[PDB]
C-alpha cells in the first residue's frame, strides 16, 4: 500500500476538540534527525572509519496554503496565534501576558491506518494577499515532536466548508478611496525561540524540544498604486512620509483597521511610474482591528 | 573445537614493466653555455 | 573473500599457480593465523566449456601438495594443454583490445582423506577462465 | 534482549570458513510464556 | 608503570595521541658582552619535556585513564612512555651480543657488534644504554666494518662499566606529571570529555 | 537492531552440505552491549524442504541436525549428498542473470524447541528462506 | 589550424605506462596564474596607475564524466585513489600508511601537435549513481602543474574498450530484497591540501605547487525509496534510525557492501511519500568491498 | 593482469633498435620499498614480432637478444636496419591521424625462461605491446 | 614526460641560415645544475629534406654540417643562400591572411653516427619536424 | 618482479638503465655567451 | 657550516624561508632636554639580529633540520647564514691583490685597487674583512681612480693590520642561537612538523 498526497488529510487538535481544515490547497513538511560525528585522526592509527550517534528530532517547519472558508473555522488561526477574541473581531494587545506561545498538536492522517502525529507544536507567521487572484492564506508552523502512528482523532462537525466567492479589494483613509490600487499583502507574526534542554540526563536517550517562549510580534502589509497626482502642484500624495495616517482596507468579507500608521513610500520608474507603501503602526495606535463576514 | 580457514594464493603474481626516456631536447633563441677556446690563442 | 576467482591464462607458456592454507583467530589482535597442515587432503579440478553437465571438457589440472607444514599447495598445466584450449576457445576477438579471449569455466575440489575413513569434500574456488593469444614461440 | 545467531558454512567437522551471516531474532530464547502456570504448579506441588 | 595505548589495549581506538610536542630543555648561563660576543656554559642536566593532546574520549576508555593516573599518584612511581612515531623499526638483532669497552665518555660511543646486528640507525633516531634511563638521540653514525661510532646528544651521564648493552627499539621514557594539582574533566553534553591533555617532564 | 529471521541458502551439486550456528545473547542495558554465549542445554532442531509453500508441496528434503557444543552454544546441520541430488534433479532450470551458477529449488525452514522446564515444551521459528543449488562442472 | 573537443584526446600517464581513456564522454578544464598589485597613493602623487606582477599558476581542477567499460580499465582510478586491490577486488585500509596521495601524469591530445602536458595532479573525488540511466562516473582531479607542449607519449594497447550493457539496480540487506527502490548515489573522497611552498628564495621566479598531504577518506552513500509498511503496527521499517546493518548494492556487473553500516533516515511529504537513506559504515566496521564483473 | 606487462614501441625507419632492461626486486613492506637488482644467471631471453595475431601471421623480425653484468641484472635487445626496414617496408599504408609519419606494423611477445632446473625449468611472458613505425626521411 | 624530438624551424629567404646544437650530461646534484659537455670526437651529423613522406618523394637540400668544438660539445648545421633559394621557389603557393609571408616546404629529419662503429647500434634520431619558408623582397 | 627500460643511445656505450633522463640537447640559432667586442678583442 | 637551504639541497624546498626580518640593535642612552635639544651616548656593539619562520614540514626536510641543529649544540660552533637579497655579483676581480693600508680605524676604508676590480658596489651592499667575521653595510662609496673610498656601517671593530683584505661576495652572518634553550617542535596526526622558527644573534 502506497499513500497519495492527493487524498491525504489534516486534522487540527486543540483544547480537547479537533479540527478539520478540509479545503486544505497545499502543505509541505520535512523530518529529521541530528547526528554527533568525529573522526579521531591518531599518530598511532590515522583511523578513515568515523564515530557517530544520532541524538534527536530536529525542529521540523511545516507549511500550509488555505483558501477562505464560509463558516470562518481558520480564524482559530489568529486565535491560536495570540490575537484575543471578540465574537468575530480580533485585536492585538498593546502588551501581552503570554510567554509561551499557544501549543497545539497535529494529525496527519491517510489511507490504510498510515498516519502521523505531530506532538507539540505553534504558529510562527500568517500571510496573505489581495493580488487580484483567489485570496490564499499562508500558514507558517513550527512542531518540536513527531512520530508514526496508526490511528487518529475522529473530527466531523467542525469541518471547513464552501469557500467564498471573489470580490475586489478597496483601500480608504477616513472614508477617502484611494486611486489606482495594484496590490495588497500582509504579513502577521510571533516570533519565538525554542528553549535547549539537553542535558548530561539525556545521554543515549533521543532529545526533543519541548518548550519555547515568545520573542516578539509583528503586524505588517505593502501595498503597490500607479503613481497618480491631481494637479502638479499638489501635496497631498507627494512622496514624503506621512504619518498618523488612519487606513483601512477590505474586501466584501474581510476587514482590516489601523487606527494609526507610519508609511514609507519608494517609487519606481517602470513603464509606468509605481508606487509602494510600507505600512507600520504608530506606538500609540489603538489596537488594530480584523473582521470576517460570512457570505449569504 | 572451533576453527576458522582461510586461504592465500598471492604468487610472484605479475613483472612490472616500466619504460622511461634518456635525453631531452630543449630550445633557447641562443646557446648561453660556451666560452672560449680561441682567448688561449690571442693570450698566446 | 568469496569462492569467485577469475583466472587468465597465457598461450604456448607452462602456467602455474601457488597456495597456502590457514588457521585464523582475531581473539588476539592482531589477528593471528597459522599454516594449516595438510597432510592428507588431496585436490581436484577439470575446465570445461559450459556449467552444462553435458558441456565438454577441455583439460584437466596437474596438481600437488608441496609442503604440507607450510600448509601448501600448487596447481599447474603445461603448453600442450593449454594450447589444447587454445584450438577450442571462443574466437570473439574484441574489436578494440583484441588479446583476452573467453574459453569456459572451471571448478577446483579438495577431498580430506584421513584416518577414521570418512571422507568430505569442499569446493575452493570457481570461476571464469580466459585465454590471452601466443604471438611468439 | 535481543538474541544474536551467527552461522557459518562447515567445511570439514568443526572447521569452518569465513563467510558468515547474522540473524538477530527479537526476542530471547531465555523468554517464558504460559510455560510460567505448569512451573508455578510443579513449584507448588514441591513446596 | 607503562603508560596504556593502542598497543597494550589495541581496542581503545580512541586513546591514542592527536598530537605530541617533544621539547628540549637545556639550561645554560647566557651572558652578552659588549664586544658583541655571546657565551654560552652548559650547567645542569638537560631534560625532555612531552607534551600530549588526546581527542575526544567516550567514558570508558576515560574511566581508564584515570583510573591509571590515580594509581599512580598513590604509588609515587614513574610514568613509562614510548614514542609510536620513533618505535618504527630500523636495527634488529640480539643486542644482548653487542659489547660496549668500558670507560668511554664524552659525547661518542664506540662499540663492535660482531657483525650481529642489521641494518643501520638515522640520524634522529633515539638511543639508550640498558642500565640508565636517559634516553639520547643520534646525531651522527659512521660504520667501520662491524665496529660502530655513534655521536649522541645529549653528553653521556655517566662513564660505561663496560657492562651496557644498547637498545635501539622499545625506549621508554621515565617520566613525572607536573599538571596533577588541579586536574579535571568537562562531560561534554554530547557525552564526551574534551582537552584531556598532559604535560609530561623526564625525571633522572 | 534489524529482527531479521530470514537468509537464503545455497547449496553445490554433487557436494555434501552442512552449516554451524553460534547462540549469543546480547543485552543493551549497558554499553557497549555485552554478548553471552548462549547455554543450548535441552533445545532441539527440526527443519524441511519443500519445492513451494503450498500445502501439497512435496518435500524435498529434511535435515540432519545436532547440537554440537552445548556450553558454547554450537550446532550444526547438514544435508548428506544424496539429499543434493535429489534438490539438483528437482530444481529448475531457470538460471539467474546476475549468478547463472545459480538455480532455484525451494523453501526451508529451521524450526527450533525448548524441553526444558516442567517437562513442556515450546516451538518457533528462528530462521526461514529460499534455497538454491549452483551448478558444479568437476563431478 | 584551430582546435576540437569532438576529436580531442586525453591520455593518462603513471608508473611508466600509459593509459588510454578512449570512452571519453565529457571534460572540463581552467587554467589561470595569480597575480600581486598595489596602487600606492601617495600624497605626494595620487598614482593611478597600478603596479603589479604575476607570480604563480593557480592549481587547476580537472572534471571528467566516463562511461563504464568492458576491460574495466577505470579500476585503475580506484588503486589511484588509494584503494588497496586483489584482482578485481577493491577495499578500503581501515588505516592507511600514506602521506602523500599517489601522484600521477596527465596529456591531453589534439591534432597538429597542439598538446598539452599536467605534470603532477592527484584524484580528489569519485562520484556516480544508478538512478535508472547509463551509470557515468564522475571523477574530481586537482593538478599543480600545467604547460603547452608539441608531443606525447603514444599508449594504443591500455584502450578502454566497449561499454557494458544496462542493467537495473538491486539493493539488500542479508539477502532480503529491498521493496520500492528509486535511486542510490555513492561518492568517495580523498580530500588533501596543498602544502604552500613559496619563498623569498622564489622571487622573480614563476612559482608551483609540488606537494600535497592526505587530510582524510570518505566513503558514502544515499538510497531513494518510496515509503511503505507490510502492516501498520510494523516495526522493521519505521522511521527510527537502524545501526549494524549490513548493506549490500549492486548491479549485474559491478557490487559494493559495506559489512555495518549506520543510517540516518528523512521523509518528504512529495505526492508519494519519499524516504532518504544517508548511509556511513560504524567505526567497528569490517572493509567495505567493491568488485567488477565483465560481461560475456 | 595484462595492464602492466605491455609497452607500445616505436621503432623508426632506416636506423637500428636497441633497448636495455634492469631486473629490480622488490618489498615494499618498508617505505621506501626495498630494492635489488635479480640475479640474472641461467636465464635467456626471447622474442618475436608478428603482423597479427593469428597462427598464420608473418614472423616480421626476432630480437636480438643479450645478458650483460648478470650479476647487475642488465639484458639489452634490438634489430638491425635490415629488420627496421624490412618491416618499414611491410607495415600498413595508413597513416595515423595525430601523427601522420606514424604507421601501425603488428604485435610482438618476449618471454623468458630458465636454462638451469633451479627451483624451475620454466618460461613467463615478461612483457608485450604492439610495434609502430614512425617513418623517416633521410637515409 | 617525453624527448620533444618534434621541433619545426622557419628560414628566411634570400638569407644564409644556421643553427647551433650543445650535447650535456647533466647531474642535479646541487641548484647550479652540474651540466657537462660531451665528447663530439668522432661523430657526424647527416640531415636532409624532402618534399612529402614517401618513397620516392622529392629531395629538396641536405645540410651543410661541422663540429665547432670537440670539448665545449658543440656541433652546427647550415643551409647557404642557394639552397634556400632552391626552397622558395618549390614550396607551395598557399598564403594565410593574417601571415602572407609564412609558407609550408617540407619535412627534416637529423640523424647522428659514430665515425667508427661501436657495432650494437651506430646511429640514431636526433629531431625531426617540418620546415616553413618566410617569403623576402631583398637581396 | 619489476623491470625498468630504456633506449639504447650510441653515446653512452653501455650502462644499466636509470629512472631519469641523462643527456640533454639544447638548441639555438647564436650564441650569446660571445660578445663580439670581446671576440674582436681576442683577435686583434 | 650553513643553515641547509633550496641551493644546497633543491630537493627540500621548505627549508626555504617563508619570510625573514633583518633587525639592527644600537643600543644607546637618551634624553630630551627642556631646552628641545636631544643628547645620546653611545657604548656597546651594534648588532645584526635575524628572524627566520618555516612552514609546515615534512619528516625527512625536518630530520635534515633536526640533525643539523643538534649537531650545531654537540659542537658548540656557530651557525652560518646567507641572506637571498643581497645575492649579486656586481663586484669581481682578484680581490687578495688589493692591498689594504694599516692603521685605517674608524668608520672610512680607503683602498688601492690598483686597476684590478671591475664594477663598483652601491650603497646598501654588503661589506666584509677577510680576517674577521663581522658583516658591515655600505653607507657611500667613492673614486679617484685605483684609489677608493668607502663609509662603512657600523664603525669598525678592529684598526687594520694591513693583512686584511675586503670581500664583496658570498658573505655569511655568522650566528648563534638565542632561541635554542627551549627549542622544540609540534607533530600533528597529518604527519607534519609545525610552529618551527629561529631568532638568530650574530656573534663574533
Excluded at chain 1, 501635496?235 to 476587514?255: A, H, K
Excluded at chain 3, 579440478?45 to 553435458?54: Q, V
Excluded at chain 5, 665496529?147 to 622499545?170: C, H, M, Q, R
Aim: net charge negative; hydrophobic share 35%; with cysteine.
Amino acid at each position: 500500500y502506497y499513500s497519495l498526497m492527493r487524498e491525504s488529510k489534516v486534522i487540527v487538535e486543540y483544547d480537547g476538540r479537533a479540527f478539520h481544515f478540509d479545503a486544505l490547497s497545499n502543505y509541505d513538511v520535512q523530518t529529521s534527525y541530528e547526528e554527533f560525528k568525529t573522526l579521531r585522526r591518531t599518530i598511532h592509527r590515522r583511523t578513515n572509519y568515523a564515530d557517530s550517534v544520532i541524538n534527536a528530532q530536529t525542529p521540523s517547519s511545516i507549511s500550509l496554503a488555505i483558501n477562505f472558508s464560509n463558516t470562518l473555522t481558520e480564524a482559530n488561526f489568529f486565535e491560536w496565534l495570540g490575537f484575543d477574541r471578540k465574537g468575530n473581531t480580533f485585536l492585538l494587545p498593546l502588551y501581552s501576558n503570554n510567554i509561551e506561545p499557544i501549543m497545539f498538536n497535529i494529525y496527519i492522517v491517510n489511507k490504510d491506518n498510515n498516519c502521523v502525529y505531530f506532538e507539540n507544536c505553534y504558529v510562527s507567521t500568517v500571510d496573505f494577499s489581495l493580488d487580484k487572484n483567489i485570496p490564499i492564506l499562508n500558514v507558517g508552523i513550527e512542531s518540536g515532536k513527531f512520530s508514526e502512528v496508526s490511528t487518529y482523532r475522529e473530527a466531523a462537525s467542525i469541518i471547513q466548508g464552501e469557500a467564498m466567492s471573489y470580490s475586489p479589494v478597496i483601500v480608504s483613509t477616513n472614508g477617502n478611496i484611494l486611486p489606482g490600487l495594484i496590490s495588497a499583502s500582509l504579513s502577521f507574526q510571533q516570533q519565538c525561540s525554542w528553549r535547549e534542554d539537553k542535558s548530561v540526563f539525556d545521554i543515549n536517550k533521543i532529545y526533543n524540544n519541548k518548550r519555547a517562549y515568545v520573542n516578539e510580534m509583528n503586524a505588517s502589509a505593502t501595498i503597490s498604486l500607479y503613481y497618480l497626482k491631481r494637479f502638479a502642484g499638489d501635496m497631498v500624495y507627494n512622496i514624503e512620509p506621512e504619518t498618523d495616517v488612519p487606513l483601512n482596507i477590505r474586501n466584501n468579507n474581510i476587514s482590516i483597521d489601523f487606527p494609526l500608521a507610519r508609511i514609507s513610500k519608494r517609487l519606481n520608474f517602470s513603464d509606468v511610474y509605481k508606487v509602494e507603501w510600507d505600512i507600520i503602526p504608530t506606538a500609540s495606535s489603538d489596537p488594530v482591528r480584523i473582521d470576517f463576514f460570512g457570505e449569504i | 573445537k572451533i576453527i576458522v580457514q582461510q586461504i592465500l594464493n598471492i604468487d610472484d603474481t605479475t613483472t612490472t614493466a616500466s619504460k622511461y626516456p634518456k635525453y631531452t631536447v630543449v630550445l633557447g633563441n641562443s646557446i648561453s653555455s660556451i666560452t672560449a677556446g680561441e682567448l688561449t690563442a690571442a693570450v698566446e | 573473500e568469496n569462492r569467485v576467482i577469475d583466472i587468465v591464462v597465457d598461450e604456448k607458456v607452462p602456467y602455474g599457480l601457488i597456495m597456502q592454507f590457514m588457521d585464523v583467530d582475531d581473539s588476539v589482535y592482531p589477528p593471528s593465523e597459522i599454516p594449516v597442515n595438510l597432510t592428507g587432503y588431496s585436490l581436484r579440478g577439470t575446465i570445461k566449456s559450459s556449467l552444462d553437465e553435458n558441456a565438454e571438457t577441455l583439460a584437466s589440472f596437474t596438481t600437488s601438495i608441496i609442503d604440507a607444514a607450510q600448509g601448501a599447495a600448487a596447481i599447474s598445466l603445461s603448453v600442450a594443454d593449454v594450447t589444447n584450449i587454445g584450438e577450442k576457445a571462443s574466437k570473439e576477438r574484441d574489436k578494440y583490445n583484441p588479446r583476452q579471449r573467453f574459453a569456459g569455466y572451471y571448478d577446483i575440489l579438495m577431498t580430506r582423506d584421513v584416518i577414521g575413513s570418512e571422507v568430505s569434500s569442499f569446493r575452493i574456488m570457481e570461476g571464469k577462465v580466459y585465454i590471452s593469444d601466443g604471438v611468439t614461440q | 534482549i535481543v538474541q544474536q545467531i551467527l552461522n557459518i558454512d562447515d567445511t570439514t567437522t568443526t572447521a569452518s570458513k569465513y563467510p558468515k551471516y547474522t540473524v538477530v531474532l527479537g526476542n530471547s530464547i531465555s523468554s517464558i510464556t504460559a510455560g510460567e502456570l505448569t512451573a508455578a504448579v510443579e513449584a507448588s506441588a514441591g513446596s | 608503570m607503562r603508560l596504556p595505548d593502542p598497543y597494550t589495549n589495541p581496542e581503545l581506538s580512541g586513546l591514542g595521541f592527536e598530537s605530541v610536542n617533544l621539547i628540549d630543555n637545556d639550561p645554560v648561563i647566557r651572558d652578552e658582552l659588549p664586544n658583541g660576543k655571546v657565551n654560552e656554559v652548559k650547567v645542569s642536566a638537560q631534560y625532555w619535556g612531552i607534551n600530549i593532546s588526546y581527542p575526544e574520549l567516550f567514558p570508558d576508555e576515560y574511566s581508564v585513564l584515570d583510573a591509571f593516573i590515580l594509581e599512580y599518584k598513590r604509588t609515587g612511581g614513574y610514568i613509562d612512555v614510548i614514542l609510536p612515531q620513533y618505535e618504527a623499526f630500523r636495527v634488529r638483532g640480539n643486542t644482548n651480543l653487542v659489547n660496549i669497552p668500558a670507560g668511554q665518555k664524552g659525547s661518542n660511543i664506540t662499540m663492535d657488534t660482531q657483525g650481529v646486528l642489521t641494518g643501520i640507525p638515522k640520524p634522529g633516531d633515539l638511543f639508550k644504554l640498558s642500565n640508565h634511563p636517559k634516553v639520547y638521540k643520534i646525531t651522527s653514525f659512521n660504520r667501520s666494518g662491524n665496529s660502530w661510532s655513534i655521536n649522541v646528544y645529549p653528553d653521556l651521564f655517566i662513564t660505561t662499566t663496560g657492562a651496557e648493552k644498547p637498545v635501539f627499539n622499545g625506549i621508554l621514557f621515565r617520566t613525572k606529571l607536573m599538571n596533577g594539582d588541579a586536574f579535571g574533566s568537562t562531560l561534554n553534553n554530547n557525552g564526551t570529555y574534551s582537552g584531556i591533555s598532559l604535560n609530561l617532564r623526564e625525571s633522572l
